[PDB]
């Protein structure tokens, strides 16, 4: 695999040594700035997942600390970090009624929408030691 840069191999230990860390995961291309312990509520029902399934997130746009920020050109190398989530369940919104109507026309067409949403829980967000790599 492509070797990690020498500049990233010397500053990553300083990035992981700081108190807090955040990441910008990309689910189906859409970003989500999360932290270890956050609860992500995706705007769609992930198909083929039941409450309790563990997912490994491998597309991170930015993984930075207070002062330092690791940025990959398209994305960061998966070997640097390890982010995992757990499927907590599915939530739904209240029914919304949209009334499509025109002036001087009695017909009022109704549109009932009630979408489901998958809820995740970031239970692991750690930076790996790349001293050997």
């Amino acid at each position: 695999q492509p070797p990690i840069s020498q500049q990233v191999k010397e500053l990553l230990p300083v990035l992981a040594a700081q108190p807090g860390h955040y990441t910008t995961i990309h689910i189906h291309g859409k970003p989500y700035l999360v932290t270890e312990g956050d609860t992500v509520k995706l705007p769609f029902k992930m198909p083929g997942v039941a409450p309790g399934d563990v997912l490994r997130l491998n597309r991170a746009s930015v993984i930075g600390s207070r002062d330092l920020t690791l940025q990959g050109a398209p994305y960061v190398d998966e070997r640097l970090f390890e982010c995992r989530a757990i499927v907590m369940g599915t939530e739904s919104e209240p029914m919304r009624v949209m009334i499509k109507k025109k002036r001087r026309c009695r017909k009022k067409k109704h549109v009932f929408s009630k979408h489901k949403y998958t809820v995740l829980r970031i239970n692991q967000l750690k930076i790996n030691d790349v001293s050997s790599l």
């Binding site: 995961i25 990309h26 689910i27 189906h28 291309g29 083929g48 997942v49 039941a50 409450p51 309790g52 399934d53 563990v54 997912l55 490994r56 997130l57 491998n58 597309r59 995992r84 989530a85």
Partner: protein, 138 residues
């Protein structure tokens, strides 16, 4: 060679003939791509809608699948551990952990065949009043 034709503009207020040059090409909606061989019959069909489409020379024709896959976004996640499930058509799929790789689906007419802990199993587990953890481990 093929012509990669993409409808960049619409033809709402354009004459009906323009609409049926686009129908012959297969451009129904906006930003729709179609592939046609490089021939006079198709080249003249584009000169009528040259103000609406974007043409490009491509070596081969792309299948409908590949064209969709160009815009597909990376999933960004991998299901590594699946809890026990019940497939309505197959049966009960036991817990599987892909981190150490086994999706075994047991179907039957009795609780034992499903592979779950039954009431009888709980009774034999409660009768083993002699099993004890090793003192070193305790």
């Amino acid at each position: 060679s093929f012509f990669r034709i993409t409808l960049h503009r619409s033809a709402i207020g354009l004459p009906k003939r323009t609409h049926g040059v686009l129908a012959a090409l297969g451009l129904r909606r906006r930003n729709q791509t179609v592939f046609h061989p490089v021939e006079p019959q198709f080249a003249g069909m584009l000169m009528k809608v040259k103000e609406l489409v974007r043409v490009e020379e491509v070596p081969h024709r792309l299948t409908k699948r590949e064209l969709k896959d160009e815009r597909k976004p990376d999933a960004g996640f991998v299901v590594e551990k699946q809890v026990r499930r019940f497939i309505p058509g197959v049966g009960v799929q036991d817990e599987v952990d892909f981190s150490k790789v086994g999706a075994v689906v047991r179907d039957g007419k009795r609780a034992g065949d499903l592979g779950v802990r039954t009431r009888s199993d709980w009774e034999v587990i409660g009768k083993m009043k002699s099993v004890l953890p090793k003192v070193k481990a305790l």
